A paper describes a structure:
Strept­avidin, a 52.8 kDa protein (four monomers in the asymmetric unit) from [name], is one of these cases: this 508-residue tetrameric protein has no sulfur-containing residues nor any other significant anomalous scatterers.
Native SAD can be a successful method even in particularly difficult cases where few anomalous scatterers are present. The strept­avidin–biotin complex has a Bijvoet ratio of 0.6% at 6 keV, one of the lowest yet tested, and crystallizes in the monoclinic space group P21. Using the low-dose, multi-orientation method described above, a total of 5040° (14 × 360°) of data were collected from a large (50 × 150 × 200 µm) single crystal of strept­avidin–biotin over two different areas of the crystal and at varying orientations. At 6 keV energy and a sample-to-detector distance of 120 mm, the resolution of the native SAD data collected was 2.1 Å. The phase-extended map was used for model building with ARP/wARP, and refinement with phenix.refine proceeded smoothly thereafter.
Author numbering:
A (entry chain D), B (entry chain B): 8 to 126
C (entry chain C): 8 to 127
D (entry chain A): 7 to 125
Amino acid sequence: GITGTWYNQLGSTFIVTAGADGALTGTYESAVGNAESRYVLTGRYDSAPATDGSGTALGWTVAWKNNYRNAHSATTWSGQYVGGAEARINTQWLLTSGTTEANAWKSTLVGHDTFTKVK
Amino acid sequence: GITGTWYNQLGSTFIVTAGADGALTGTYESAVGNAESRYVLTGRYDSAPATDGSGTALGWTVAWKNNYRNAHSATTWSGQYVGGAEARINTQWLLTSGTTEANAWKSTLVGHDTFTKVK
Amino acid sequence: GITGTWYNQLGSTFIVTAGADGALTGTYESAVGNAESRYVLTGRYDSAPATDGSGTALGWTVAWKNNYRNAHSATTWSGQYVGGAEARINTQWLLTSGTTEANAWKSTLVGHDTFTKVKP
Amino acid sequence: AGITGTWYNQLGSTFIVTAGADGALTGTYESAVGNAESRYVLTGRYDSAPATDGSGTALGWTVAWKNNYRNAHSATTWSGQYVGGAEARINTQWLLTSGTTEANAWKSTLVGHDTFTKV
Ligand SMILES: O=C(O)CCCC[C@@H]1SC[C@@H]2NC(=O)N[C@@H]21
Ligand SMILES: O=C(O)CCCC[C@@H]1SC[C@@H]2NC(=O)N[C@@H]21
Ligand SMILES: O=C(O)CCCC[C@@H]1SC[C@@H]2NC(=O)N[C@@H]21
Ligand SMILES: O=C(O)CCCC[C@@H]1SC[C@@H]2NC(=O)N[C@@H]21
C-alpha cells in the first residue's frame, strides 16, 4: 500500500518504493525551503504490521544535497501509514541544519506532515 | 569520520558505514525497549559539509522488526556529526509506534541521544 | 481574540483568558489519556504581536493533577494564534511523565493539536 | 520544595522559579542566547503530589519573549521533570514557536533539550 506517489499539505511530492525486506527508497521534492528538484531518500518500514487495525510504522531521511544545491541539512520523518479509502501517511519530522557548536541550540526544526494519495 | 562503531548514553550500539554517495548503512542494537539483537538501519548524510566549523547534518531510521522480534515501531534520528579529537554525533529522535486512529495522539516519543566512539 | 472556549481535533476543551500583560489562565479538559474533568492551566502570550500578518506566539502548561486523579505528568503546548474569518490556534506539544532515571528515555510524548472555537 | 530557587542550564541561561503549594510555577528566565535581553516572566505548573518511588516530578513552563526591553514575537515552552538528591536536576525538552505568516508556518518551531542544575 505504501509504494507510490504521495503529497503533503505543503504540496511536496514523496515518491517511494517499499521493498519486501523493509526498505524505503525513492525521491523527495519539497514545495518549500532551501530545495529544488528531487532528493534521494532512504528509510525503513514495518513489513509485518499488527494483525489488528493499527498503522504501519515507518521513517525516512532526506539529506538536502543534490546536483543543484546543498542546504547543509537533513530531515527525518517518523510516522505511520494508514491504508483504506483515504489512505494517509501521518508524520512528525525533525530538520537538523549543520551548525557551529555555539549555535547548536537552534539547529533543529520540528513539524508534522500529512501525506495523501491526492494533492 | 562517521564510519565506525558508536555508542550512546544508554549503551546502545550504532554500527554505520558512510558511503561516498551520501548513504548511511549499518545496524543498531538498543540497550532499552522492546528490542533484541541487531536491526537494519539506513540513512543519509551531507557528503559535502560546510568548511566553516559547522557540523555535518545526517539522519537515519530503524524499523524495530528483525528475525527475533517486532515492536511495530520505528525510530528516526536527526542530528549532526561533530568532528574533532573527540568526535560526537548529537541527535534528537522520534519513535513512532503503529496505533489505532483513536490512539494516534500518543503514537510518538521524542528524545535525544549523543553518540561517541568510546565503548 | 485568544480569550474564549476552544476545542481541538480530539474534542478536548481549552477555556482561556488572555490578560493585558501577557498572562494566559484557564482550564483544560482532555478527551483522551489518564485524565478526567478540568485541570488548571497557566501560560504566556505575546501581547504586542507583529502587524505584518504573522501569528501571535503563545504557550501554556497543564500538570495532570486535580481533585479526581493524578497522572504524574505535564503537557506544554507551544504555538501561535492565527486570527481571521476562522480563528485557529496551531500547536505542538510535549507531554512528560515523571519516570525513574532508567526509564527517562521514554518519558516524553510529542504531538500537535489544532484548536478552533467550533463546538464538536 | 526542591524546585524553588535558581537554576542554570548548559547554555548559561538562568531560571529563577518559585513552586507554590497548589502546583503553580512563577518566576523569571534570562537566556544566554537568542533574541533576548534581561529577564522575562515565566509561568507554569508542576505535580505537587509526585510519586514517592524515586520517579521525577513532572513540570512545564512558558516564556513569551517580550519584556520592557524588546519583543522577539516568540514563545518557548519547557516540558520535563525535576529529580532531587545530591546532584539535583531539571531535565527538559522545549519547543520555541515564532509568530509566522501561514506560508512560513512549516518552519515556525525549534525543538531542543535543556538540562538545569543548581550549579
Ligand atoms: O530548507 C532546507 O534546509 C531544506 C528543505 C526543507 C523542507 C522541509 S522538510 C519538512 C517540511 N516538509 C516538506 O515537504 N518540506 C519541509
Ligand atoms: O521499544 C521499541 O518500540 C523499540 C526500541 C526503541 C529504543 C529507543 S530508540 C530511541 C532510544 N535510543 C536508544 O538507543 N534506544 C531508545
Ligand atoms: O495521560 C496523561 O498523562 C494526561 C492526559 C494527557 C492528554 C494529552 S495532552 C496532549 C494531547 N492533547 C489533548 O487534548 N490530550 C492529549
Ligand atoms: O530568540 C528568541 O526568539 C528568544 C530567545 C530563545 C532562547 C531559547 S529558549 C530555548 C533555549 N534555552 C535557552 O536557555 N535559550 C534558548
